Amino acid sequence: SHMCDAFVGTWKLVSSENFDDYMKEVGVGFATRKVAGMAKPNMIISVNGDVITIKSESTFKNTEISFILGQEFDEVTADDRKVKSTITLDGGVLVHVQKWDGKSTTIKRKREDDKLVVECVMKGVTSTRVYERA
């Protein structure tokens, strides 16, 4: 048993709050915000040794990241930003920081009851995205 066991699995988005405002704060344009805001992504998390893989699949885009905790990597986000990402574990919470164009956003993923709760923060704006097991 290991680090992220309770995150591993296939998850489906069941609720979202303030995601449009988060996307605005990030700089996402109108058409992408409207189309991306409809999606109910599946998040598939797996671990193989030190390598964590998070796939996110939706009608809008399929994305995939693989990474080692604490080790920066390149990520192309669903809204087509080219970012430099670092993901760490902080007291059981996966903390994902994305840097691009002098900007920064942080995405936190945590287990709460039977849900996986995703909190996306850009300056003063937070969006909460709740996933349940598929």
Ligand X SMILES: Nc1nc(N)c2ccsc2n1
Q: Which of 61, 101, 66, 89 is nearest to 77 (CA)?
A: 61
Query: How far is residue 30's CA from residue 26's CA, in Å, rounded to a whole number?
Result: 12
- Chain position carrying tokens 């909460």: 128
Check: CB of residue 35 under 8 Å from CB of residue 28: no
Check: CB of residue 129 under 8 Å from CB of residue 19: yes
129 is in an annotated binding site: yes
By beta-carbon proximity to ligand X, the closer residue of 56 and 85 is 56
With CB under 6 A as the contact rule, the residue among 56, 98, 105, 127 that binds ligand X is 56
Contact between 58 and ligand X by CB under 6 A: the answer reads yes
Report, in Å, the least distance between residue 57 CB and ligand X.
6
130 is in an annotated binding site: yes
Residues 72-101 that bind ligand X (CB under 6 A): 78
Applying CB under 6 A, the residues found at the interface with ligand X are 36, 39, 41, 56-58, 60-63, 78
Q: Which residues are annotated as a binding site for a fatty acid?
A: 129-131
Q: Which residues are annotated as a binding site?
A: 129-131
